[PDB]
Amino acid sequence: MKINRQQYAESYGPTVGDQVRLADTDLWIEVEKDYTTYGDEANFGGGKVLREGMGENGTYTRTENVLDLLLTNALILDYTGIYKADIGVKDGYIVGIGKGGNPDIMDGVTPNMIVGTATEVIAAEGKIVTAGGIDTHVHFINPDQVDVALANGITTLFGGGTGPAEGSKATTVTPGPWNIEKMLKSTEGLPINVGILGKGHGSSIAPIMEQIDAGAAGLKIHEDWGATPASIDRSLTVADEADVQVAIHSDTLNEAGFLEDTLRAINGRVIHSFHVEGAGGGHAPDIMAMAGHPNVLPSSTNPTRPFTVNTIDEHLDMLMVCHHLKQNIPEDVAFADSRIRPETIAAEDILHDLGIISMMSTDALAMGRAGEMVLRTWQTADKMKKQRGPLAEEKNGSDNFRAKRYVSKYTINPAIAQGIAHEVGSIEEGKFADLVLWEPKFFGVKADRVIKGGIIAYAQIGDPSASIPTPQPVMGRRMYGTVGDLIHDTNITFMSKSSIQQGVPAKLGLKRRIGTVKNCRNIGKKDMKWNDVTTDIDINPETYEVKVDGEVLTCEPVKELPMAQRYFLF
């Protein structure tokens, strides 16, 4: 008996060779392989396969290769591949990617993916499943920002702040032992993974290091605290000792140095360059040249992503409002014109497409949008396909190569940069079960369900008084993973090895899962999945034109984007 490929895809989701459109973009992903055994597909419901003695095993106790949760028939989109599999979760981690069910009667069952008495089922047939997004440029300004992040598929927030204090409103900084302790306690109530950055400023080691020992997961060097040679040098000396990452927003004003001075202070040590294009901050006009260096892990923030007809007008005024600039102070106008540059914003689109900028991030509530990292990644990929054509690496008319290059920018690459990819950032066996289900029609726009540590934390779901959950109004809502003590077991606080060794979690009474930051001094650009290109980036100081391999990088701004007015009420 045979099923045509349209009916097969309707029932079980797509299989090998089938393509799926990403929302209302021009981007097509193709199923590369499928772990199923055709006819033994797992499914749940009335008269379906996952029933006792059938696709559900009735013999094995939970410890005996039985799952706590099976996602059936998932279309995985990950740096590791675009492929069809069941996903098995146990003790809050991904334990099996393959074929779930009952070895009693089914062929091809992955041995540790038994559906048993202990197993919950999520139907992923017809869904795209990705890793949770890893946002490494978060300002903690307003707790309302967390649901905004969850609604667009973000599961980890790395950054800093104490709420809407001016220090926090400009910089990803939780400064000093006391502010760090207070925000680790606050974190107990936030339904998302968190890591806190200390102030990467000082001329003595001790004031900087004591933040790492207090429970910071990294440092932020910001020009608003003095992005001087000394603050850069001391921060990186601390980071090399403590095994944590340093993020930098460099000296835009070129007050104590130009870019070459900042690179000399770094002295070949690993650093994460934030908003590397420079509208969000950095050496005017040539900061984006950072992204060519082997020791630099370069991220964009999201408002420049991608280059549109309203970008420049919006950014010139945003910078006026953010910096309190006056239109009748010539030095303010000159500063703004030196910082907001169509030449570097247009080049930023192409550097993303070429794998020269490795990461996306938000700059949430300081100069960026908490719920638009995933959204603007795909809008950029779609613009680049329209303006540059399929990449040479593509086959079968699919955009799989571009889809793996771009999904890496907000999943695995930030995780690697931060020293947390042992826990999060990809759908791989042994990693924490932070998973986002998307309807293809809503892909990258509005998440269906966000799984945190193997329990749903956030869902687009309807009327709580209704007979069924699908009636209006369908909106983003916190789910049982956020409630009571379950918020502790489904979320990770990432901390320095030293703060963990010194017992800070017990001292502060932290109940959340504790994640260890490690292995982020030994990495470089080569470690950025699908985004590992080093090259000489030339930025003309007079014209701001960007050149790579002697070729000017330029593209036009677009009048319209997908993943925009078809979807949003405002």
Binding site: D24, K48, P440
Partner: protein, 122 residues
């Protein structure tokens, strides 16, 4: 170039289910006065006692239908179905408690079926 957000472009061809397993056609009759619907993955010998068929021909088998679908028998309805072989370890536990081990133990399965009044033990 009309865009249907999230639409499929499925490849050419057909998906063969249960490829390479033996197929068997049998006649089955609902002798009861209420409808019986049978799922794709129930050990076929263990269905409702009031379905009359050659019970031996249901041992080690299930319906050769797409995963998660069912065959329906209205009251008094007789029709043919196609069976495929169980796979994996070819063991069944629970359901109607007729097997609880290897599907190879045909005589033991049929003795329990007959004693409990599963129609059609020949």
């Amino acid at each position: 170039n009309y865009i249907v957000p999230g639409e499929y472009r499925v490849a050419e061809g057909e998906i063969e289910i249960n490829a390479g397993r033996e197929k068997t056609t049998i006649r089955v009759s609902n002798t009861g006065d209420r409808p019986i619907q049978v799922g794709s993955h129930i050990h076929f010998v263990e269905v409702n006692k009031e379905l009359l068929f050659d019970r031996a021909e249901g041992i080690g088998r299930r319906l050769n239908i797409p995963s998660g679908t069912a065959a329906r028998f209205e009251p008094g309805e007789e029709m043919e179905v196609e069976l495929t072989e169980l796979g994996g370890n070819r063991e069944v536990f629970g359901i109607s408690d007729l097997t609880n081990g290897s599907v190879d133990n045909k005589e033991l399965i049929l003795q329990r079926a007959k004693e409990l009044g599963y129609k059609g033990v020949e």
